[PDB]
Design an enzyme around this catalytic site. Sequence first.
Site, PDB file in Angstrom:
ATOM      1  N   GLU A  33       0.828  -1.212   0.000  1.00 22.77           N
ATOM      2  CA  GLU A  33       0.000   0.000   0.000  1.00 22.77           C
ATOM      3  C   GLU A  33       0.868   1.271   0.000  1.00 22.77           C
ATOM      4  OE1 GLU A  33      -3.392   0.249  -0.455  1.00 22.77           O
ATOM      5  OE2 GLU A  33      -3.372  -1.925  -0.736  1.00 22.77           O
ATOM      6  N   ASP A  50      -5.619   9.102  -1.278  1.00 23.05           N
ATOM      7  CA  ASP A  50      -5.192   8.208  -0.207  1.00 23.05           C
ATOM      8  C   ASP A  50      -3.908   8.739   0.445  1.00 23.05           C
ATOM      9  OD1 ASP A  50      -7.269   6.562  -1.322  1.00 23.05           O
ATOM     10  OD2 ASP A  50      -5.855   5.145  -2.223  1.00 23.05           O
TER      11      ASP A  50
END
EC number: 3.2.1.17
Length: 120
Positions: A33, A50
């Site tokens: 991620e 994000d």
Amino acid sequence: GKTFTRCGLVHELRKHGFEENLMRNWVCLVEHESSRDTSKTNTNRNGSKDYGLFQINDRYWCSKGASPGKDCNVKCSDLLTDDITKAAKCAKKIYKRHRFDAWYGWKNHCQGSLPDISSC
């Protein structure tokens, strides 16, 4: 913002209330991620972004504004600071409903292989 090593991340999460039996899944998820980097960001096709070590989104969990005020009571820019805890505590509040399924890397690559933590 800074980057962490696997031994540093394993320790940081152990101090932040992550289970030693889940640590392999958590570090292998985080390594896909954010690559263990608090400064990392990614834009979505839906126009949101994000932020932080768990790549937490400004429309769903953290807030993009000058103050916190979203589902995990935390600000997207506070996730970019030199302690992961602002992102890690929000990651526990997600894990209460979606233990790993809220992150695409875990269902894309952690299903094949996990790293060792027995040296940490």
